[PDB]
């Protein structure tokens, strides 16, 4: 299950 | 007519820079769902969305290189090829073509465009 890397900053 | 589906340049809150994307939904209360060109989807206040497609000639912008660096420049050209937009960016007397999503605006650069293009 992949997530957008910009979620790493939340 | 409707803003839904229109290309914009909008602020990513994590660094304050504005990036190319599209409005995908009106979520009310002065807010819009954005799909950035890089695939990230989130909600953004109208005041942080610039309704320009393309960024106009002579705009001061920031260009991202393929190797993770950024530099300031000025838009001097546009070209469409195979349904994709490219910008000619001028820096120190020379120019380089960049794909649409590699042209961004710093906070100061986006602020200059708010009165004319901002949605809030």
GROMACS .gro file of C-alpha atoms in nm, chain B residues 19-111:
model
   93
   29UNK     CA    1   0.310   2.441  -0.725
   30UNK     CA    2   0.123   2.350  -1.045
   31UNK     CA    3  -0.202   2.157  -0.998
   32UNK     CA    4  -0.574   2.148  -1.074
   33UNK     CA    5  -0.883   2.221  -0.868
   34UNK     CA    6  -1.080   1.894  -0.840
   35UNK     CA    7  -1.357   1.981  -0.594
   36UNK     CA    8  -1.525   2.275  -0.425
   37UNK     CA    9  -1.522   2.177  -0.055
   38UNK     CA   10  -1.694   2.491   0.066
   39UNK     CA   11  -1.597   2.761   0.312
   40UNK     CA   12  -1.348   2.925   0.076
   41UNK     CA   13  -1.162   2.596   0.035
   42UNK     CA   14  -1.084   2.380  -0.271
   43UNK     CA   15  -0.948   2.028  -0.315
   44UNK     CA   16  -0.637   2.039  -0.529
   45UNK     CA   17  -0.466   1.767  -0.725
   46UNK     CA   18  -0.106   1.874  -0.767
   47UNK     CA   19   0.071   1.764  -1.085
   48UNK     CA   20   0.289   1.537  -0.869
   49UNK     CA   21  -0.021   1.345  -0.762
   50UNK     CA   22  -0.063   1.486  -0.414
   51UNK     CA   23  -0.420   1.576  -0.321
   52UNK     CA   24  -0.517   1.811  -0.037
   53UNK     CA   25  -0.741   2.104   0.052
   54UNK     CA   26  -0.616   2.461  -0.006
   55UNK     CA   27  -0.768   2.798   0.088
   56UNK     CA   28  -0.873   3.014  -0.204
   57UNK     CA   29  -0.631   3.286  -0.091
   58UNK     CA   30  -0.347   3.039  -0.152
   59UNK     CA   31  -0.459   2.949  -0.505
   60UNK     CA   32  -0.350   3.145  -0.812
   61UNK     CA   33  -0.572   3.105  -1.116
   62UNK     CA   34  -0.310   3.132  -1.388
   63UNK     CA   35  -0.256   2.886  -1.669
   64UNK     CA   36   0.008   2.953  -1.789
   65UNK     CA   37   0.212   3.162  -1.550
   66UNK     CA   38   0.234   3.485  -1.751
   67UNK     CA   39   0.535   3.606  -1.949
   68UNK     CA   40   0.778   3.819  -1.742
   69UNK     CA   41   0.673   3.663  -1.410
   70UNK     CA   42   0.954   3.611  -1.157
   71UNK     CA   43   0.954   3.238  -1.071
   72UNK     CA   44   1.166   2.960  -0.926
   73UNK     CA   45   1.279   2.663  -1.135
   74UNK     CA   46   1.353   2.313  -1.000
   75UNK     CA   47   1.635   2.119  -1.166
   76UNK     CA   48   1.624   1.743  -1.220
   77UNK     CA   49   1.891   1.709  -0.950
   78UNK     CA   50   1.707   1.873  -0.655
   79UNK     CA   51   1.829   2.231  -0.685
   80UNK     CA   52   1.629   2.550  -0.732
   81UNK     CA   53   1.709   2.890  -0.879
   82UNK     CA   54   1.517   3.208  -0.953
   83UNK     CA   55   1.438   3.317  -1.307
   84UNK     CA   56   1.186   3.497  -1.526
   85UNK     CA   57   0.930   3.340  -1.760
   86UNK     CA   58   1.019   3.435  -2.118
   87UNK     CA   59   0.840   3.169  -2.320
   88UNK     CA   60   0.573   2.899  -2.332
   89UNK     CA   61   0.535   2.604  -2.564
   90UNK     CA   62   0.284   2.321  -2.591
   91UNK     CA   63   0.398   1.979  -2.713
   92UNK     CA   64   0.200   1.655  -2.704
   93UNK     CA   65  -0.054   1.818  -2.472
   94UNK     CA   66   0.214   1.924  -2.224
   95UNK     CA   67   0.327   2.277  -2.133
   96UNK     CA   68   0.691   2.385  -2.109
   97UNK     CA   69   0.831   2.715  -1.984
   98UNK     CA   70   1.133   2.903  -2.110
   99UNK     CA   71   1.302   3.044  -1.799
  100UNK     CA   72   1.566   3.315  -1.819
  101UNK     CA   73   1.844   3.345  -1.561
  102UNK     CA   74   2.157   3.563  -1.590
  103UNK     CA   75   2.113   3.626  -1.963
  104UNK     CA   76   2.054   3.263  -2.060
  105UNK     CA   77   1.744   3.042  -2.097
  106UNK     CA   78   1.635   2.685  -2.033
  107UNK     CA   79   1.315   2.492  -2.107
  108UNK     CA   80   1.147   2.334  -1.803
  109UNK     CA   81   0.840   2.115  -1.777
  110UNK     CA   82   0.532   2.285  -1.625
  111UNK     CA   83   0.555   2.113  -1.290
  112UNK     CA   84   0.919   2.218  -1.240
  113UNK     CA   85   0.823   2.587  -1.234
  114UNK     CA   86   0.713   2.703  -0.890
  115UNK     CA   87   0.672   3.029  -0.696
  116UNK     CA   88   0.832   3.122  -0.366
  117UNK     CA   89   0.607   3.286  -0.107
  118UNK     CA   90   0.726   3.631  -0.217
  119UNK     CA   91   0.682   3.542  -0.581
  120UNK     CA   92   0.332   3.404  -0.530
  121UNK     CA   93   0.238   3.705  -0.319
   0.00000   0.00000   0.00000
